[PDB]
Design a protein around this nucleic acid. Sequence first.
RNA 1: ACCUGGGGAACUGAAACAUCUCAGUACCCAGAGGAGAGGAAAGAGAAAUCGACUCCCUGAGUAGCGGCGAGCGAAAGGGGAC
RNA 2: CAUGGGGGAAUCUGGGCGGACCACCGCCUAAGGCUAAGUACUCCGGGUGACCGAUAGCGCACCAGUACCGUGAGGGAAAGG
RNA 3: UGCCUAUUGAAGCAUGAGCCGGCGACUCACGGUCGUGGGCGAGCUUAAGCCGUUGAGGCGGAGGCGUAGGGAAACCGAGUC
RNA 4: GAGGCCCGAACCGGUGGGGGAUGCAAACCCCUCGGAUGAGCUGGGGCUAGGAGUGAAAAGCUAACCGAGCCCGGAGAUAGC
RNA 5: ACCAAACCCUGUCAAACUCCGAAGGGUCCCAGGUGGAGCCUGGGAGUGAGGGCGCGAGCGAUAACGUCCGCGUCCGAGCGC
RNA 6: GGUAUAGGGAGCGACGCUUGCCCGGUGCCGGAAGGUCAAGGGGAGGGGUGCAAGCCCCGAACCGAAGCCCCGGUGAACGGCG
RNA 7: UUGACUGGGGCGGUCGCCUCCUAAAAGGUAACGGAGGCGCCCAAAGGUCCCCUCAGGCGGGACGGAAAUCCGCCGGAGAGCGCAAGGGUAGAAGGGGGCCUGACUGCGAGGCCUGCAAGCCGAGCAGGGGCGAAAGCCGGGCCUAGUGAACCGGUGGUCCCGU
Lengths: 85, 97, 63, 44
Amino acid sequence: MAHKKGLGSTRNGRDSQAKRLGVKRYEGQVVRAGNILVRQRGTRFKPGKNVGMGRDFTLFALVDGVVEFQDRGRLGRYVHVRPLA
Amino acid sequence: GRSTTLMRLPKRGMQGQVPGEIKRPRYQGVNLKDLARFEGEVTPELLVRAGLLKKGYRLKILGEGEAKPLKVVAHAFSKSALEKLKAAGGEPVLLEA
Amino acid sequence: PKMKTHKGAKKRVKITASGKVVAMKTGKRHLNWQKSGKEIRQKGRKFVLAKPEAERIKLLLPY
Amino acid sequence: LLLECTECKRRNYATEKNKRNTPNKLELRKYCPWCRKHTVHREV
RNA sequence: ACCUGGGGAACUGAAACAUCUCAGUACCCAGAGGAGAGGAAAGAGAAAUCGACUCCCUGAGUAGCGGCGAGCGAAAGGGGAC
RNA sequence: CAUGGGGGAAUCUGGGCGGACCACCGCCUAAGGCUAAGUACUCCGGGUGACCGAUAGCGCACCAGUACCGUGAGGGAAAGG
RNA sequence: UGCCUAUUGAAGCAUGAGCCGGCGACUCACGGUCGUGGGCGAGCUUAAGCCGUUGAGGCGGAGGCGUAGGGAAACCGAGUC
RNA sequence: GAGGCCCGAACCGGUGGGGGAUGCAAACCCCUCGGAUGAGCUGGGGCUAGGAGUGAAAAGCUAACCGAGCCCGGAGAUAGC
RNA sequence: ACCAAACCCUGUCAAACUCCGAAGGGUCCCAGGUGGAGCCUGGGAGUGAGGGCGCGAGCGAUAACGUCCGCGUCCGAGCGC
RNA sequence: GGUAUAGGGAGCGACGCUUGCCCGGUGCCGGAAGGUCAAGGGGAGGGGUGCAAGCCCCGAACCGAAGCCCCGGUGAACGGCG
RNA sequence: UUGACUGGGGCGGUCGCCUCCUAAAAGGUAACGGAGGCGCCCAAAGGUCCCCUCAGGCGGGACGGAAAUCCGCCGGAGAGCGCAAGGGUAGAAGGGGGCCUGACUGCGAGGCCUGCAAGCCGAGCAGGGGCGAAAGCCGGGCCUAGUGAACCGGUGGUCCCGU
């Protein structure tokens, strides 16, 4: 045989399933009301013009329009929808 | 060897007691848009033997189209079906025997 | 010989007209899951995509 | 505890959840019934 | 061979298995005969109803039965033979 | 509807049934028996076949349930011109 | 660097085959679903059986699909829940 | 003149070795061994059977492969190989 | 005597550190692009045993024709030239 | 066609010298008390119906075996012996 | 009848969910690879209106450690945010107070994710409410874990069925 005697202190097999987050609708994309725009951990992207978020910080459009992003540094990064004609 | 989809719950309630089905009066439906197809005196039997029914039991008219005047016997009509031919037609109905 | 209809399937699914298979919502069946969450509300009927093609074939006669 | 609120002198339930030992007992509070609009709904 | 009665399996299926299934089948036994069985209502079941029994076609894979699983599955009524 | 065990009636002011149980409404007469036909089968006789044609068709077209095998139950050929 | 098979990978020192000749494996029944060739079309169609035929076909509407769907059901109805 | 006494034929058996290994033989031959008045050997006639028999007991024997005989049947068992 | 807290320099290190941050990748818009391209519905599948090489990482020992993933490719099916 | 000097089961295995301690757990034996306990007895009380008498249904106390719990013995009983 | 995974099997360890990393700057991504949690908890730890802003460091102060409580400067977040980690956050999601009970009923456009079936977000309309003068906010909790198809029954309720 020439056998051994291995074992496992394995106390690490583990992990949660991916939750797929991020900017789901980048800037410039025409969107209908309700389209969640961003899935975020915290408030990585603050809600802007015509954009609301719920319990899990999920930001979504409030009207029909184009998506526009914006940096405000000390203020933060915002995402909003500008309607049209 | 998983679960099929015998996973979905049987909502279909009120289903099968034991002696069996319950002998209850069935009502075959027929629109008058398929009725005006002819004229005169339209009543059960006169149907079945043609068009719809066939011992289908109770004859309840109703429907779209626009039936013309001609006393039409039946077992039931719609709050619509009535008014619809109320313009000119018949109110034959029920039974007492 | 004369395929027999699959009772169980019949007991839990109503097939509409245009050929859609529709059944209830798993999850709420008298909770057993328990203490609400306004979720209980969202339980009407539903369309079983792709799995009805199979569902259906089990009711060949009963239609 | 799996609690529910029985509108006094009728039916309906709210299906709440108290904490017993943790100051409880005598749970009841203005909820909306299906049999017309509000009452208070007790425990049980 | 077919038939009636008395007894009466398992393999298999359920992608394990015990209820269930196969199946009252295989087989064993008694008995009947050119057939055997059944047969003149303490019936059926909703029809002001029908009118011995048996056989076929429907009814119907319906009604139902079922670890409501796998799977099993009528009867009335309607056509016929007699 | 049958029936092994226990209890155990009544004779038409009787008794059973219509899916627990009552009450209505209605059906039928239990605890004795016989009864043709239409139905089933194919040892047997005949007639047909988008049936086989001797490694097929029956296991046997021939002296086959034979020879041979097996204690036995039983298994079981070949071979036509 | 044979043939077949099985393989990530075979001439392969992996499987099978001595050679030849015969026998030798996706069928039929009933349901069902698409496609297709036809008949008929708001209609279509017969079962069992009776009548003829003796390799004549008729007859037979019980029944079955389809003409309305929603709803657990009552029920309603181009609506319905 | 006693004896599950001794040596040793017949008779019963099968210790060790060689040979045999498509055998003379589906357990044999040669040499060598154990028992040999006993719980002995042997003829003839009878009885016990398949989850059963028989067994000084090895799961041994039950018609030349027994941790469940053989034959026929369920039967074309089932085979994710 | 830095044995030695913080603290300031001089030097540095880090998959689970980041003040910073490429190439690149993803998507939307406008264009190009007639391709065994696409998209919608439906009938039939097989496959669900991969393997090598290159590049990027785990495990290993900066071992393995080792082992797991990721992008690509070829073999598989091009053991044809 | 026998009758405890006999039969059955078990273990050890001529003969000699011997065969210690442990009944907590298991088994077996013994315990006319208690505990628990199934049919069945019993009917407090309630329900379905009818106009009713009634016909039907559930059903508490309590009375109820073996078994088990409980009390105790037991090692050539299973076993154990820092 | 006596499970599977498994650098043969047994033994050992493990089996669902959450969070970092591996993961190669969209997602997603393996290994018996590295490293930790969950199977609950809040009747206030929930609504809304109105207020307040931390941790530290440095002095100064009766009892008083090296932070008990005070006063004074400095200190943009290193505290806090019920429990793991992460993201987020004081221009509050943190600390306190007053009234409250939307931890509602009917619904649900439009999406996220995705084989299925599940999971997640959600504006808006109706009804009848809360807090605020108001604009307004309110279908539980800073957010991601705290969970289990069907079948079979149990308690209620009710427009239904009831041979």
